[PDB]
Design a protein around this ligand. Sequence first.
Ligand SMILES: [Ca+2]
Ligand SMILES: [Ca+2]
Ligand SMILES: [Ca+2]
Ligand SMILES: [Ca+2]
Ligand SMILES: [Ca+2]
Ligand SMILES: [Ca+2]
Ligand SMILES: [Ca+2]
Ligand SMILES: [Ca+2]
Ligand SMILES: [Fe+3]
Ligand SMILES: [Fe+3]
Ligand SMILES: [Zn+2]
Ligand SMILES: [Zn+2]
Lengths: 153, 146, 357, 357, 13
Amino acid sequence: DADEIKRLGKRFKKLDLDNSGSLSVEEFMSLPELQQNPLVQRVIDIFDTDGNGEVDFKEFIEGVSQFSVKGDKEQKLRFAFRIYDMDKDGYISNGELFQVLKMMVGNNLKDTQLQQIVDKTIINADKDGDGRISFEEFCAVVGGLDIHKKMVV
Amino acid sequence: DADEIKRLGKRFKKLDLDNSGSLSVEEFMSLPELQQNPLVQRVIDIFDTDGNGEVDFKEFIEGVSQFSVKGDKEQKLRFAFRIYDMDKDGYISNGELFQVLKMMVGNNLKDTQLQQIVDKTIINADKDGDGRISFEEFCAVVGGLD
Amino acid sequence: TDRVVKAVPFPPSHRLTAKEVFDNDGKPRVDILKAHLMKEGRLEESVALRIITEGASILRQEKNLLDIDAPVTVCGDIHGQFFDLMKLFEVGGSPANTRYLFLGDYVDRGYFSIECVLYLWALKILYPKTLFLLRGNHECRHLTEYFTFKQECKIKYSERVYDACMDAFDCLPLAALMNQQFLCVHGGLSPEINTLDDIRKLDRFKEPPAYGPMCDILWSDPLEDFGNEKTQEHFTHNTVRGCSYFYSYPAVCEFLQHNNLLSILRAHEAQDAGYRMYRKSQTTGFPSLITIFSAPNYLDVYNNKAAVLKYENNVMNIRQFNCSPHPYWLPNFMDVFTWSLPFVGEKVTEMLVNVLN
Amino acid sequence: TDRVVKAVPFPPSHRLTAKEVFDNDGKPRVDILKAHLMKEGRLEESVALRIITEGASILRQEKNLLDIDAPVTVCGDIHGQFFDLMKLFEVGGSPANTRYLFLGDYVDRGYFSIECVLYLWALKILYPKTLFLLRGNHECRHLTEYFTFKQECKIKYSERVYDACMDAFDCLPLAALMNQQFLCVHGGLSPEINTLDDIRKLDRFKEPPAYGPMCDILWSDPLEDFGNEKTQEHFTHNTVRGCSYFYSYPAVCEFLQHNNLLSILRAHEAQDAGYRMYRKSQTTGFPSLITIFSAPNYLDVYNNKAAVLKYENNVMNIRQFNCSPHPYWLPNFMDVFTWSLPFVGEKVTEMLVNVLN
Amino acid sequence: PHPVIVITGPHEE
Ligand SMILES: [Ca+2]
Ligand SMILES: [Ca+2]
Ligand SMILES: [Ca+2]
Ligand SMILES: [Ca+2]
Ligand SMILES: [Ca+2]
Ligand SMILES: [Ca+2]
Ligand SMILES: [Ca+2]
Ligand SMILES: [Ca+2]
Ligand SMILES: [Fe+3]
Ligand SMILES: [Fe+3]
Ligand SMILES: [Zn+2]
Ligand SMILES: [Zn+2]
């Protein structure tokens, strides 16, 4: 494991263009791939634990660790859940699901079309009727897919 | 006209609020009856011989002159023509007839409807083919009406 | 130019000459005629006159009671709705390969009666044996004078054209036996018409009388309660029309059985659906009477559909169609000067009167 | 709340209870049902099962060949287009005072099949002697498994609801003798069906076989060049369907005359105009075959009109109609999580790989 | 023996 931090350290330093100790959105968007990926900002936001807008080394380490052969379905899905859960309050609201989906789908669906499938998605999974989605209910809908198996780096 | 000019002058000075020596459009719209008359603008423009926008006394005199029990048919028909002949070049064009009628019809007719009957009136009275109505052609149409 | 509504099509001022309307074979170029008339174009008075006279010549040779074979497309009232007539032909089939039978009322009310007459006459000249036209009650002097056709001619053409049309209308056949099974007329029956031969005996070349056989063929209507009558009167005076009669279901059946006919096909009364089928005969089980009406959105207000009857061997196809857009016209074909001048005069007078106080 | 497009209607979460759908007399509240299904609301599973099973009991009592007298409104394919079905009843008349006959294919392709089934079955329970339903080729296990109905039942309700529908579909009558003039079936004729009695001998309570009379009734089509065929074979194998046949104009005519029938009314094939009338029989002069198709803008792409056939002794009225708006559904009835998670797990993993390389 | 009546339309085209 001691080697991992050294590798991650050298990597963190490279990405750190101005060498300030943290990683800004501007620097992540320096890479050729991390600018065509519609979910880069969402990933940065999740790694950004203290909400300072940037990603320091420790957060970089904790973020990367979620995607390991050591981890299990649990944390993998939690990270998945966090993508949709924008304000991080432990629930996926109707608006958040729409916005995050809008990010991936772009203009391929009309607003009314995307909204209707968002409503039916929530109605189907919302077992307590509070109009939103908790982690438990999320796991209930997406669990047999085994998406966590492809979430490894 | 000699003593009549004095009579009119009286009415001119009262109508001309600011006493500037000329009558503006606003000063004409001061009267309660002319505020609902759709031909007010047309009559003023006609009286407005030098096209400065206002109607001076000279034009007021000569303007009222057009109307007199003494005036013959030709004089009334000519004035009627000026009502339609907006740019005063002596020929009623398609667009003018449309705009003058539009002031009288208001929204009672759809633009498309008004355009069609305007085109049809011209084609039938346009004896020389220029697509405009001369005074000669005008008189031929409104000849035996009154 | 300073034309305000550019979007709107300007009618052509050029009048089609004889050379452009008639080819050197004597046949009229109906397609050119159509395109021109549809643009609200005019033909030289003499050309319209030729169309009307030649059409009359052909009609004049036909019989009071036409013999028409199936298949055929039967049409009701047109009433000067030229633009709906263009669609009527799309729906019913091209006269180039479709037999037609019109039941009258080509003029009045609509503001394109002369175009309807000119196009139909042109078609009659071109297809003498396949397109047929019957006389309707409006095809006469008395009604075209009171309504709009006489005035339409005077404003678009001349009274000379009106007179020529009046003579042409006098030649119009009064009825038709179709497929040897249907009696086709504009209005209906007459207490003085017991057989088809009674129709052949008539002198149709004249202005319709105020009463009698000819009058009834052009003006009678079925009773309001046709088929559900409480009065055994076969023929009662038509107080709605001011002449002729109302005929009852028994009256029709009697005429049908006596004459070995299946049904009476007529027009004369507007129908919201473009047609109406009345009580079936007890003897055949087929509608004793059928009203066909071809003027969609009649008078620009009723929003009714129009229809035509395509008859084939043992199959009657009623085809409905909606109205088409048409140019605007002021009442009585009045020009904008005549229309607005009186108002302009009193408004300028009014303005000067108030100012001089 | 977070809800972005607030103007879009939100489906209710409450599932109609038994006492809400059925009343004291055991009659379904079709108006409450309609209004609720139009908002994409569901019923309690048990209530759904009750409607399906009770309708099945009624269907199970009917004969293979129904005897439907005039008047009646004959309808073609619906294919889960529930919102167009609502329009259908508006054009064809209220079931409360209108007799109906649907030719099948109530499910698959459209995303509101279960709603169509629950509504039609409820209507069948309420109007057992005036609303008739035939079996279409899609009303079986084989096709609903391959297309969309099964998955629809599983996502919106349960597999139990699916199984109940499969049981009910087996009860569906195969044909109808309408007004003793028309043979009504989804697909068409069979080389193994020479008379109407052959249809009565069949055992319909089962999954349709891949071959035989029952299969042909549900799957056959007229030849592509029907009526204008240079093909002497009356029945040729249907390579398009993968089973059954293509029947020719002669086959139909021979079958019509032999059974003293006027025409065959069927669906099974989409029509741009909502219907089609094929070559007239030389024995009656009437269209030998008629196809009725009731799903407008089929599959949201055809832009076709739909139609119903309203009939009464010797009067056939073809009424057309256009599509109506309907809610949006992702393919296979997927929820947004199942739809995007694979993408999310991929994009995030894709980001980290480049970040660490 | 007599013709059947078929009503179609409104024929938009
Ligand atoms: Ca930095
Ligand atoms: Ca941070
Ligand atoms: Ca949240
Ligand atoms: Ca919840
Ligand atoms: Ca002034
Ligand atoms: Ca001036
Ligand atoms: Ca001018
Ligand atoms: Ca001119
Ligand atoms: Fe009439
Ligand atoms: Fe189908
Ligand atoms: Zn009439
Ligand atoms: Zn089918």
